[PDB]
Symmetry: C4
Subunit: 389 residues, 4 copies
Amino acid sequence: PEWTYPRLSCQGSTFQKALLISPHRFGEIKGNSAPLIIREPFVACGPKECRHFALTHYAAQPGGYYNGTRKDRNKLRHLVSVKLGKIPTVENSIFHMAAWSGSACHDGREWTYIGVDGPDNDALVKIKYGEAYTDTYHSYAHNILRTQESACNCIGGDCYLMITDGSASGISKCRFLKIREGRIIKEILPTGRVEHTEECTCGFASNKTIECACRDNSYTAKRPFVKLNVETDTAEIRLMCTKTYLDTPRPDDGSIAGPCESNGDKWLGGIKGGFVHQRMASKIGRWYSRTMSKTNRMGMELYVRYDGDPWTDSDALTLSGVMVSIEEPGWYSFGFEIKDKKCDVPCIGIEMVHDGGKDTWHSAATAIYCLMGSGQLLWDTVTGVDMAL
Amino acid sequence: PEWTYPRLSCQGSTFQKALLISPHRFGEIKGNSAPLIIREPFVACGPKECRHFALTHYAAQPGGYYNGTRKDRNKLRHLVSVKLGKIPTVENSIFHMAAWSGSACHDGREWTYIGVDGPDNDALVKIKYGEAYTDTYHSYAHNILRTQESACNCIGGDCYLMITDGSASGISKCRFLKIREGRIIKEILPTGRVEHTEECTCGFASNKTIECACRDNSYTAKRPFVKLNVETDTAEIRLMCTKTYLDTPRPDDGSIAGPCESNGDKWLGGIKGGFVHQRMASKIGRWYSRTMSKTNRMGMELYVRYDGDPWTDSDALTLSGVMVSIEEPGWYSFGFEIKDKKCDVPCIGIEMVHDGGKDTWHSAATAIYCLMGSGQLLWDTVTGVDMAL
Amino acid sequence: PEWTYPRLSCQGSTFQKALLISPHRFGEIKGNSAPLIIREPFVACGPKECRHFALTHYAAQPGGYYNGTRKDRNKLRHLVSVKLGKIPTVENSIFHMAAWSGSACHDGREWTYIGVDGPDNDALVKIKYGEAYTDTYHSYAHNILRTQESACNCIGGDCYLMITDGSASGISKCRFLKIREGRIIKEILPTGRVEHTEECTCGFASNKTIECACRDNSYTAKRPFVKLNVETDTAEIRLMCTKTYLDTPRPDDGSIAGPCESNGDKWLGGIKGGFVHQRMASKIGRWYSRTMSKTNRMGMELYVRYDGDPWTDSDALTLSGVMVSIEEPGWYSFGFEIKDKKCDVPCIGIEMVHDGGKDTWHSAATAIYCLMGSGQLLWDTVTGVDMAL
Amino acid sequence: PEWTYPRLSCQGSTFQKALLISPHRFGEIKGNSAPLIIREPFVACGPKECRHFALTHYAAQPGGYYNGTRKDRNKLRHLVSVKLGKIPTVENSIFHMAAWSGSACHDGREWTYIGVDGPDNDALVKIKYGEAYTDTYHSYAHNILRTQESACNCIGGDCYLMITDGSASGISKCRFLKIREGRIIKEILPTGRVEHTEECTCGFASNKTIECACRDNSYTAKRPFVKLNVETDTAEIRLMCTKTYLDTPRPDDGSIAGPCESNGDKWLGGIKGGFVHQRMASKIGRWYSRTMSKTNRMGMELYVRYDGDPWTDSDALTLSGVMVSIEEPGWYSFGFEIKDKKCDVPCIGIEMVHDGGKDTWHSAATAIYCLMGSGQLLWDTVTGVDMAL
Ligand SMILES: CCC(CC)Nc1cc(C(=O)O)ccc1N1C(=O)CC[C@@]1(CN)CO
Ligand SMILES: CCC(CC)Nc1cc(C(=O)O)ccc1N1C(=O)CC[C@@]1(CN)CO
Ligand SMILES: CCC(CC)Nc1cc(C(=O)O)ccc1N1C(=O)CC[C@@]1(CN)CO
Ligand SMILES: CCC(CC)Nc1cc(C(=O)O)ccc1N1C(=O)CC[C@@]1(CN)CO
């Protein structure tokens, strides 16, 4: 097998409803199924198959282990996966490794799986290449070492993964692991606005740069934007200048005064946001997704912007459609690309969490929208699940 | 892999009971299975495997989501599939895409999947090639854009699919998409009797023509018959002249006065009908299926006719056997062909719907009859399912 | 792929307990499984995989369709299969075709499946080659056309299958279909003692002959023995002369007076019996299995005999071991051969039916014994299933 | 395919938590799953896939066959397996053969499966190569012939397996079968301290020697250590001299007086212990695991020792970490190696038995730790299962 490289996107000018994976439409006390309790789903694709990954609490619905399924880190959590299209049940899934934070990507020949686990003050990034545990990385800030919760990106056998370490309420300077065949051959230290960068959604803007729309949990509702050079292996970060803030919670659009680099009010918190590229010979399409509600993880909107510099462009992004309405859950979103015969199809996935509190199960559905054809985005996604059943 | 082309049918002069897929013989409240609630099943075959496709309501039996499973369009519906022979349960199936109307065919190298979804007045045909969403088509009449609910037909890498748009009670002029590797390379506008044509069952009459027995829902109990030229890429439609009307409901045979083109009384309504070819060097066998009851979807009969012109032949078709008796359900029927080592085996499938009203689940069984050996058709198919369990 | 031919057996001088497939150890009302209700199991092997075939009543345990699962012929029955080693549940199995009598064999390139179905007075043998229905054969005596319920045997692409037609209480002259790539290229009419021959268990005695130990249901407790010539394509039948009668019920051993050809008392009834060959350069080992109880299908014994002529040898067979004790069920038995790297391993399977009457489910377990190593047969098989659960 | 040979271990200096397979986190009376009741799990890897083997009591949870699932030998037990990562449910697993003691290994081309079964005083080792039963071996001491309960080791197509026969409370002289393509081509009689050696965990110390840390059930808390020469095909056994006794129960470390060969008090009993190698060009790392509690199978500790002679080195092993705390079960442990692209990854598995007495089910979880990266062992494994559900 030969190495994967980003190619031109397939042509299209709009995203449409592609696929909904609602595992819990089969979790009734009356039904006879075993969908796993999961969270932080993401899709990664190899040249031949796409895979629906997720972090399971090692429990099913119906079941008797709902207690604690709303908390994120523990000794039971595992990175699991199914072929995209398959329902993630107890028997359908493959357990890759113990992890309460993960990532995965296909280098063209084999699958690389990233799972972080261990004690908060000394967590560990573990790397698996296919069936073999090949390497690990240690906590540097000693405050919950974590990773992307979305696909890593490989080019010519070299895969780049964002990791971060630090306080959720303070400073978390991220790093980038350059992995090759399962072993870390390099650690990239980004430059610029480094005070807080987590849950980066990365993709190839070209064969020279990898860009990530990330999450700042302590200082702003603006998403830190990473420009990583795959030739010089150097990264530099700074805020997306756009009026259309993509974090949640956030203030009114255009609400933040000052130059591009202004944080504005902290707006304590954030969320992982969808972001994927549309590469054309002439232009670059940057697709973003963000919650409909400014304060809550309800709904999901699609935005596009062709060309410009995310760092210096104060202009608003263009609304491209409602993927999820305000009455449906809109939690984490990510980007991924399906590999078609000659070109790449960009897609955005939306984690639709079923929240009913700490005193009941807590799992998620995954909605998929991909670039296809033209015109306007036509329909939205509902999970269809009734938590009382 | 090299492209698929229609070949001569394998020899035989009769159809026999081949296979019954009754998923709900395992849906008892007492059992431990999860058969999906489906409707509009159809079978399509590649050079190596056949597949049982269907439109699921994203629900199982036993389960708690039976409400609404009798209606056809919604945001939960999906085109799913299993290898033919497998029971379509929650774990066995693969979810291809969101669709409340579909179609699928194998071009010799890859699977093409068609799923239509979106709002009634602006629905959308979406095309998937293997794992990639490759193209889409828009509503032209702005009244529920829909498709076949049966296999599309490929020849040399070119696949033809019938789509229609319009009122069920009025005019619905159908169109034909010429698809290649997932992208629409052409849109064919048929000539002739174009006022209403839906749910076309198409097949190859030869390497030059594709014929479809279709459904007219507003004006007649006679089935519109399409003759599509694969070399000039032009279609022309007009009513089957035969005395033996194949739609449901319909009047007594021979009941309609006038020339071949007479509609007769509207007989509001219709049904998708089975139709498949038997190609011989010398002759063409055209196999049709139609409900036993004239007014209700109960029972299913097999009919044959060798040669002639469906458009100008007023003669009765020859009764070839009772596949389903009047006491068993006989809903949609379709044609498909299994690819044997040197020749093609024509088959007719019958959707056997379990109807018990809107206040209980609504799913279907699929009976298969294929050309094999000679003599007369020997036995019928019962679903064996008791809806009370 | 190149054609299969019988090779020399692997060396050994004894059979040992190999594998037990007890699907109903998982059918408790308390459990969460769906083992299929089956009967008439048999194993057939290709060059690479063996398969556990059976005739399902299209029902599971626990379930609500036990009524009628004790009767043998109906419109719901199907020939199904799983990889040998897999439990035959609703999801594990593949439904091949509708059949209330079957057979199957691998010709070295593809699977051939035989299923007989239709009305008793006009049943039909249907042949499937891989995915394609390729041919059929008709009732000649017009009294339940049936077949082997065990593997057919292929040599150089030619597969021989025994079929029989007629009364169970009278005459049933069997025939032999020579099948090639799914189509009957010849019908062999046996010579000799032809009055009653059913459920023949056949195997290769060499590359020239196929021998079957069969069942006479009307006239004797002696098993009709078939010697079929694969070069001249002619068969001839006559009773096994041995003192050790292998049918059930039967009288005391040596009980029947007269020459080899004497029927003795009718002993109305019979059973399919295990029979497999052990080919050595110098000698031929013939392995037989028969119930421990003379009148009931309880227990199973193993017998061997090297060389001689089954037709003229009045000598007793040698007891080789108790595979099943008198307190466990011992119903149908068959032979099959696993293909090892250079040689063939002969095995005998025993259908262990769970009978509790007509007012509860009726299914079976399958025990496997194969030639391996030397010494004496060491342990027996119990199903372990409690029918009350 | 070409034969497997041991290669250099991948680099690393520590073990980390890799994967937990807790099948019973899905066995609730409320859930809808069927995890098998198992014991004596072990992992073996081929060049491309690893497999989770185990000895099932042919029963599931929830189910109604818990009675007797705490005893080890019977006619229902079977050696089963799933791909490592898959949950061992009724449908996921493959039943290889009837065995109440087993072993398995991949020679580079095919799977070899060892299962011992039969009556205690005349048990039998049966060998299966892929699908074929190829050979068997007999009881020599006529007291429960048994084997490893962990992977056998192949080199150049030759696989070595330890078997033992004898009293658990007295003498059990072990033997070593040299197997090739399923048939025993040689029986090795070890020299030295031969009075009691069972459940040997073996691995390749190099291409010349296979070393096993084994179990002495009658005379000491010191583990018998086997040095087997693959070139001369001779074995020799004697006690590990180390202060750090690895059996359970055992006295305080350094507690046993006398020279390396002193037994000390019998400390009636024992346990299978984990042991795997870390081959470097220059040095050999020997990894051992042993229960945390001296008297009970609670907890599991990791120990290492580079170079030296296990037979003459009285020094303590180095504590390398707590894999399981004293409050969690720590039963059998074994070693295995995943084959990475160029090197081998050593791992230790821990069987975590769910014991609640004889009056409820008795099954196990399997925790995996593998060499990866450096630093110290970071986290422990909990099963997470509540036996009351
Ligand atoms: C901003 C990072 C915070 C705090 C550290 N982590 C976090 C937040 C959320 C959420 O719902 O916002 C879900 C999961 C996590 N996660 C954790 O708590 C550990 C890693 C993981 C992802 N960051 C995944 O479980
Ligand atoms: C004559 C077409 C009508 C009305 C538009 N559609 C329709 C009818 C029936 C039926 O039972 O007759 C089932 C499904 C549909 N379908 C729909 O309602 C949308 C497309 C689909 C097939 N035509 C499949 O769901
Ligand atoms: C001696 C043949 C008899 C009577 C015709 N058939 C028969 C007998 C038994 C039995 O338990 O003995 C089981 C199945 C059948 N079978 C049938 O009733 C139809 C074919 C099949 C096998 N002979 C399999 O279902
Ligand atoms: C020290 C060997 C003893 C006594 C013979 N056997 C034994 C002990 C234990 C245990 O929990 O210690 C489990 C299983 C067995 N086993 C048996 O009883 C038969 C073989 C097998 C492994 N030795 C596996 O079932």
